[PDB]
Every structure is written in C-alpha cells, then in structure tokens.
Amino acid sequence: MDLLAELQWRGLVNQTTDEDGLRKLLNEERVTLYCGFDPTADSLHIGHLATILTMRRFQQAGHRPIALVGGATGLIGDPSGKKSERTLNAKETVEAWSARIKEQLGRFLDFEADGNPAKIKNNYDWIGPLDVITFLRDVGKHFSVNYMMAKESVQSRIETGISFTEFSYMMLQAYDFLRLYETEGCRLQIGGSDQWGNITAGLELIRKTKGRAFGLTIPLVTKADGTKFGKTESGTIWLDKEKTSPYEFYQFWINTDDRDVIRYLKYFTFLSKEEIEALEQELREAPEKRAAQKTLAEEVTKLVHGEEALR
Amino acid sequence: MDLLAELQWRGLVNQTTDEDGLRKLLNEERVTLYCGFDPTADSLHIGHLATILTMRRFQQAGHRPIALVGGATGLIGDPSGKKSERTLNAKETVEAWSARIKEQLGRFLDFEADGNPAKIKNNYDWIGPLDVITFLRDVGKHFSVNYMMAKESVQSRIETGISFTEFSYMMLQAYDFLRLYETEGCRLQIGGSDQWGNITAGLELIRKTKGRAFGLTIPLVTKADGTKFGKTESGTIWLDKEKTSPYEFYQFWINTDDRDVIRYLKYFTFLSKEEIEALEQELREAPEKRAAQKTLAEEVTKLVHGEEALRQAIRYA
Ligand SMILES: N[C@@H](Cc1ccc(O)cc1)C(=O)O
Ligand SMILES: N[C@@H](Cc1ccc(O)cc1)C(=O)O
C-alpha cells in the first residue's frame, strides 16, 4: 500500500499479478515472500542487488523473506533471458557455488528478527529426491504444451532451438512456488523481469492444484546513457570481496554518472524519500560537489561489505 | 532375409527404418528384440495379438523376444493413437494390471528354448527409481522441442490439447530402447503403426548417446467394411478366458467377414503360404462351407486358450 507505492516511487515494480489484491495483503497481513537465485558462478554480482535489496525492503516493512538457492534448478538451466542453449554445469561445481551464494545472501537478511526472521532454502531438498513418475503426474498433468510454448522464454528460442531440459525448467520453478506455498505460507514471489513467465507458471500450478498468491517483477537496471549496468572494463563488479575489492567496488559507485545517480539512490539505498530529494536539490545546485554519488558509494558499500570495509 | 520376406508376405511389415540393414542382421545374427505393452486394463485384447504373434514368429526364426510390461509408462499414458487426454490410472491398479498382463504374454512365448528363451521385463525397474534431474540432464538434453513437436501423437492433439505429462511419454519409451540396448543387446524394437513416432525417438536417443539399431511396425488390423476391428456389441474380445469365454472367443472368429478371412489367416496363424493359399482356393471355389473361418477360429482358439477349450467351444456352440 505504502510499501507498494514506495517501491513504485522507487521504480522497483515492472509488473504485478493483481496490484489491488497484493496491496491489501501487504497492509493487512505479514506476508511470506520468496525470490530464487541460481548458482551460475561462484559469486553474485551487482545485477542481483536490486532483487536482494528489495527482499530486504519487504523485511523492513515486516514481511518474511525466504531467499532460495537453486541447488537443483542450477543443474537444468533457465532459458529465461538467455539467447542460446546453455552447457550443463557439473553437480560438484553447482554444489560448491551454492555454498558461496548461500553466504552472500545471508548478508542482506535478518535471521534473528522476531515475527519475521529470514530463511535461506535450497530447492535440492525437494527436487533432488523427486522421481520422474511423480513429477510428470503431479506437476506435469496441470500444464498444456500450448500454455508452455507461448511463454517468452520458449517463444524466444524456437528459431534457435531449445532442449526439452530447458523447456521443462519452468515446471521446476513452478514446483518451488507450490512447495513454499504449502510448507511456508508463501503467497508472493519476486524476481527480475525475465522471470514473469516462470512466476505466472508457479501461480497457475497452485491454482489448478489448490484454489491465493501473487507475483511481482523488478525492472532491469538502466543506464541513462543507454549503456549496460555493472559493465566496467575491469569486467563484472562481484559482491565477492576477493574478486572485486571494496576499493574497486566503492570506486564504481562514486563514478556514477550524474544523470544516473538519483535513480540509483532510489533502487539501491534505504534512504528516505525526503533524504533522496535533498540530494537531488544538491545535484542541481552543486554537482561539482558530487554529494549524491558519495552517499551512494558509502551506502551500498556498507550494505554489501560492512562498516569496516567502508573504512 | 526370409523372415522379413514372409512378414512382408503376411502383410505384417508396415514400416522399417532400414530394411536392407535389418534383413542383414537377421540373416547374420540372432537378434534380441522387444515390444512394449502398457497395462491400461486387466487383460490384453485381440488388438494385441498381431504384435505378440509377430514376436513369436521372430522367436521361431531363432531371435530372442523381450516383451516389456509398461509398469511405469502405464502410469504416464501414451498419447499415440488416442484422440484425447486420458485420466491417470492409480499405481496399485496399474500394478494389479501388470501382474495379470505378465501372465498372458507368457503363454505366447517360449522361456524354455535353446539359444533364445523369451524374457518378460517391467520398465518400473529402471524408471521407478529415475530422478527428475538425471532424467532431464541425461535424456532430455538430447531432444529438441522441435523434434517432439513434429511427432504425430503431438501434431494430432495440438488442437485438442496435450499435457506436458503425455507430451513427455516418448522420452520414457525412448529410454526403454536405450536401456535394453545397453543391458541386453536389443537392436530391434517392434510395435503397431502408431508406435512409429516413439520407436524413432528411441533410435535418436541411442544415436545421440552412443553413435546399430532398428525399428519395424506392423500395420493396424482392418475390416474390409471399414468398421472397427475387435469391437463386439458386448464390447471388446479379451484374451482373458474370464472376460471373454472360449466359446465367445471362437464365435468371434468363425464369424469373420469373407473379405477379412484370408488376411486374418496371414496375421493370426502359423499356417503356411501353401496352406493359406489352399483355403483361399476353397473360398473362391466353395464359400458356403465356410472352410476358412473354421481353421482361423480353430487356430486362434488353440493358440490363445489350448485344445481343451477349443474342444468345449466347439461343443456348446
Ligand atoms: N530461474 C531464476 C532463479 C530461480 C530459481 C528457482 C526458483 O524457484 C525461482 C527462481 C533465474 O534463472 O534467475
Ligand atoms: N507405448 C506402447 C507400449 C510401450 C511401452 C514401453 C516401451 O518401451 C515400448 C512400448 C503402447 O501404448 O502400446
């Protein structure tokens, strides 16, 4: 309501399944939400921040976040937002990564709060042991191939080609949505824009199987200059302080372009509406000063690296 | 070689991937083949005979038949030859059906032979335990959505609607082919016409997985009147002498359409060209003796039920 509006003011809402319905749920109850992360590398990078930070905004508003590490789905591969078929990673490799990603995630959430402690989950737990028979009958039966073919992630690759492995991926994330709803009271799933189709599939699964849940997507981070975000010439800014140092990390933020800066304060910091506007005024009135950028860099660096790393 | 030539002669060959290549293995080796049967009911019916009597003709030629009972594919359902989506049977049921279907295959094959005893298998054994992830990584990666989409069982239902469940069936029958190939030297798979799609998917798996194997299908059983083969007023003709009695059974056969009779002698009996021809002359030459239909009925009744039963059916009839 006020959280949804704020998110909205912050430009963190791309699409929602039912705005009026979610907003009433948010204002009424303590909502249990989830967002999943597939280990595709040994580190999360700045492109995952928006989604994590948003999970934390919800925790600050009193909701209960569940970050999910795709220990199983990571072995399959999401065609979502990918232009070509991907090579399969080794279980041993995906396993190692999971562990690393599980650690990063945990820096952003509160596992001790009362009322809404966070949780970190790995879908390997419930998919790892799923046999083919049960999957096909219990999940598979509820989806038509048509339904499936019309999803962007598949519709996008039909000229290129897609494997049955990657085409099936959405049933898996559909299943995670259903499990978490069943065991955890989860009624909201968040994700990046390309996740829309996987999100609406999970929802269709609960609906055909039960009879009460929502989806919301976060817009991709944009560069006013029309460039690509997190794209340096030292490559990727990782949240792994040994791949990308605090220095390096902090320097990245400080060099944020004036045209981008405020948008970035809104997406990435926990500053108030009122605080951000000040900064806006100061950029107008005294940009040589570069106050907005300096705040951004300290705020983000603290969040990702801690106060010590800030020093 | 000769077995092909005679299958061909009996009109039992509808399609084969590589005749030339197959005729060569048959003539050159003792081929291990398989045919699958899904328990969609407690008993097999006469729609099942052509494939079962063919397995038997192979075994007679000296190859080794493997009949697989669809312990696990029976729980998924094959869209092939079905114009709509089926209801999922329940495990306990399907399993009840498999035990029963396992006993009927057993009478058409020789487990005793020298060189090629028949074997009966149940795919629940390798699929019951398969996990989603191995399934999807190890099998799935090999198949494009395009390849699956061009199948007739799918193309045919894109209108009426097909679940991902029935969509995926072909991966399981393709996996059976591979499994048998690896563990039993199975190089040939047969089935009725509608299995053509499922048979070729099996060979793609193997080819994409190994780098050797064949498929053959038998034509669908027809009636010169264009009505449905094996459909009574009573329903279906079962192979279970407790669903359909020997008498009921026998009667079904003596009653074949004159037009249908020689064709059926070819598909359903172990008589010779020579003999078949005879009965054919008899029928042009004296069709009221109903010569043909009698042999047929006697022949199929003995195969399915034994002479004691034939004795009896001949009696109360
Ligand atoms: N598929 C998503 C992550 C994800 C994994 C599992 C889930 O249940 C939900 C989301 C991605 O590729 O980023
Ligand atoms: N699908 C076949 C039976 C079958 C099952 C498993 C196989 O591996 C092969 C064939 C049918 O419906 O008759």
Side-chain angles (χ1 to χ4, degrees), chain A residues 2-82 85 87-90 93-102 104-111 113-154 156-157 160-211 213-219 221-227 229-230 234-240 242-273 275-283 286-287 290-306 309-310, chain B residues 2-82 84-85 88-90 93-99 101-102 104-111 113 115-154 156-157 160-211 213-219 221-227 229-230 235-273 275-280 282-283 286-287 291-293 295-307 309-310 313-314 316-317:
Chain A
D2 204 57
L3 173 67
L4 196 61
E6 184 176 341
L7 281 209
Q8 235 145 217
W9 161 79
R10 285 176 195 277
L12 294 182
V13 182
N14 193 289
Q15 281 198 259
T16 60
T17 57
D18 167 7
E19 186 174 351
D20 290 357
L22 176 60
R23 163 151 49 209
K24 199 208 177 190
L25 174 68
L26 290 173
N27 303 134
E28 278 185 18
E29 298 184 37
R30 188 161 257 222
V31 173
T32 288
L33 65 155
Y34 103 90
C35 194
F37 310 77
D38 268 0
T40 58
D42 65 331
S43 191
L44 294 174
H45 58 77
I46 58 174
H48 304 108
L49 263 203
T51 193
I52 312 187
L53 295 194
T54 298
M55 280 202 295
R56 186 182 144 100
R57 298 179 194 283
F58 276 73
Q59 184 166 46
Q60 279 168 168
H63 304 99
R64 149 158 190 289
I66 301 177
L68 185 163
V69 179
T73 41
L75 297 183
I76 306 314
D78 179 15
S80 287
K82 288 164 224 197
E85 185 84 21
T87 298
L88 287 167
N89 289 305
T93 297
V94 172
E95 201 161 61
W97 283 359
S98 288
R100 288 215 109 202
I101 291 151
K102 198 197 144 299
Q104 296 185 164
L105 290 178
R107 338 181 175 153
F108 302 96
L109 289 196
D110 180 340
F111 300 80
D114 194 1
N116 59 326
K119 287 219 201 167
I120 289 181
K121 286 198 144 283
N122 177 342
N123 54 17
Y124 194 87
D125 285 10
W126 62 84
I127 292 181
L130 192 56
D131 54 287
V132 180
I133 300 316
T134 306
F135 178 71
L136 292 178
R137 297 170 73 79
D138 301 11
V139 177
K141 207 70 185 196
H142 297 298
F143 292 91
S144 66
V145 165
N146 280 107
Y147 168 94
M148 297 191 70
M149 289 295 310
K151 289 289 178 185
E152 152 89 26
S153 81
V154 178
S156 149
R157 300 273 308 272
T160 318
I162 174 153
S163 72
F164 180 79
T165 318
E166 264 201 358
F167 178 65
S168 290
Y169 185 99
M170 78 180 85
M171 305 276 98
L172 293 189
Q173 167 170 358
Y175 185 66
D176 293 342
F177 203 161
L178 177 74
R179 303 304 288 143
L180 297 186
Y181 175 97
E182 271 179 338
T183 60
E184 298 286 340
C186 188
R187 312 215 136 195
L188 160 74
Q189 181 186 169
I190 73 163
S193 283
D194 50 39
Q195 287 314 293
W196 178 252
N198 287 6
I199 298 162
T200 69
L203 277 186
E204 186 80 347
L205 179 59
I206 285 147
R207 174 191 155 269
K208 292 184 134 180
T209 287
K210 307 287 185 151
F214 315 78
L216 179 158
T217 67
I218 293 109
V221 185
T222 249
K223 255 156 102 282
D225 87 7
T227 291
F229 182 72
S234 158
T236 296
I237 309 283
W238 302 94
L239 310 183
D240 185 358
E242 291 180 344
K243 307 199 48 179
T244 298
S245 76
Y247 173 78
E248 268 169 283
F249 189 79
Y250 177 108
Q251 287 307 318
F252 165 79
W253 295 105
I254 239 156
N255 294 144
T256 287
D257 168 353
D258 289 334
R259 299 182 282 161
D260 281 344
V261 67
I262 295 295
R263 179 166 42 84
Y264 292 8
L265 281 173
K266 275 185 203 192
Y267 287 150
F268 307 121
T269 80
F270 294 76
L271 296 181
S272 87
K273 182 176 179 277
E275 292 170 295
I276 297 144
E277 291 161 10
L279 293 177
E280 189 156 1
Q281 305 146 181
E282 215 143 354
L283 152 58
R290 296 281 267 193
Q293 290 92 340
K294 185 154 194 225
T295 309
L296 177 45
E298 287 161 3
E299 281 312 296
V300 184
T301 300
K302 305 204 220 140
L303 272 184
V304 162
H305 295 301
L310 189 29
Chain B
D2 208 303
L3 187 254
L4 207 50
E6 180 200 351
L7 273 187
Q8 196 97 268
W9 161 78
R10 303 185 165 271
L12 278 169
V13 183
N14 193 242
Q15 253 304 343
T16 189
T17 59
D18 184 358
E19 178 172 16
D20 279 8
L22 169 66
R23 166 167 282 169
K24 204 187 173 232
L25 187 87
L26 287 193
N27 298 90
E28 269 199 352
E29 314 183 25
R30 172 280 218 159
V31 191
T32 295
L33 63 148
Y34 99 96
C35 183
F37 305 82
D38 274 359
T40 41
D42 65 343
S43 173
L44 287 187
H45 66 60
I46 64 205
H48 293 129
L49 277 191
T51 50
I52 308 167
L53 308 180
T54 306
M55 287 206 276
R56 174 139 174 151
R57 296 184 188 276
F58 267 92
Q59 186 167 54
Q60 279 190 234
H63 303 92
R64 172 151 146 298
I66 315 187
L68 166 172
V69 181
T73 45
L75 297 169
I76 293 309
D78 178 9
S80 289
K82 305 156 205 214
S84 272
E85 186 83 24
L88 293 173
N89 283 315
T93 311
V94 153
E95 195 173 273
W97 290 357
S98 300
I101 282 164
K102 292 185 211 101
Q104 313 191 315
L105 290 168
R107 334 147 192 177
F108 301 93
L109 298 160
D110 206 338
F111 285 101
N116 52 331
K119 294 230 195 168
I120 285 165
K121 298 202 153 182
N122 189 338
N123 70 3
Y124 193 82
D125 288 358
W126 49 92
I127 307 175
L130 200 53
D131 50 285
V132 172
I133 304 174
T134 299
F135 178 66
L136 308 168
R137 286 174 65 100
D138 288 15
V139 179
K141 205 65 178 171
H142 293 302
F143 286 100
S144 51
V145 149
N146 283 133
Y147 177 95
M148 310 182 58
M149 286 315 291
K151 301 268 187 178
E152 208 40 21
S153 62
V154 169
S156 155
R157 301 273 296 267
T160 335
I162 187 168
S163 58
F164 174 81
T165 297
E166 288 188 359
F167 178 60
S168 300
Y169 184 96
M170 77 173 84
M171 311 269 76
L172 301 179
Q173 165 156 8
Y175 182 66
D176 283 345
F177 203 169
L178 175 77
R179 261 284 302 220
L180 284 191
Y181 180 87
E182 282 184 322
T183 58
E184 305 274 341
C186 178
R187 311 271 262 209
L188 180 48
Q189 185 186 170
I190 72 158
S193 277
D194 56 342
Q195 293 303 297
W196 169 266
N198 293 344
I199 290 165
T200 60
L203 296 179
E204 188 70 8
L205 191 54
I206 292 178
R207 146 204 321 136
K208 271 166 180 169
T209 283
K210 306 263 171 196
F214 305 86
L216 178 144
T217 64
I218 307 23
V221 164
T222 270
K223 304 172 73 170
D225 79 2
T227 57
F229 177 73
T236 292
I237 307 298
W238 305 92
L239 290 205
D240 178 357
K241 94 211 175 331
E242 293 172 7
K243 302 195 53 179
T244 303
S245 59
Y247 176 61
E248 202 212 325
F249 192 87
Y250 175 87
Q251 285 316 310
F252 163 78
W253 293 109
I254 49 74
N255 288 164
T256 295
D257 180 319
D258 291 19
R259 285 184 289 165
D260 289 338
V261 196
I262 285 283
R263 217 196 312 102
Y264 288 8
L265 283 172
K266 279 147 163 215
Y267 290 160
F268 309 113
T269 71
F270 290 79
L271 284 178
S272 75
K273 182 144 152 28
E275 317 188 87
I276 300 161
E277 292 187 349
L279 283 98
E280 194 192 358
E282 232 100 318
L283 185 88
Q293 281 105 339
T295 304
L296 171 57
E298 281 175 359
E299 288 307 313
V300 185
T301 307
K302 307 187 217 201
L303 288 158
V304 176
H305 307 291
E307 317 175 355
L310 164 60
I314 271 159
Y316 286 102

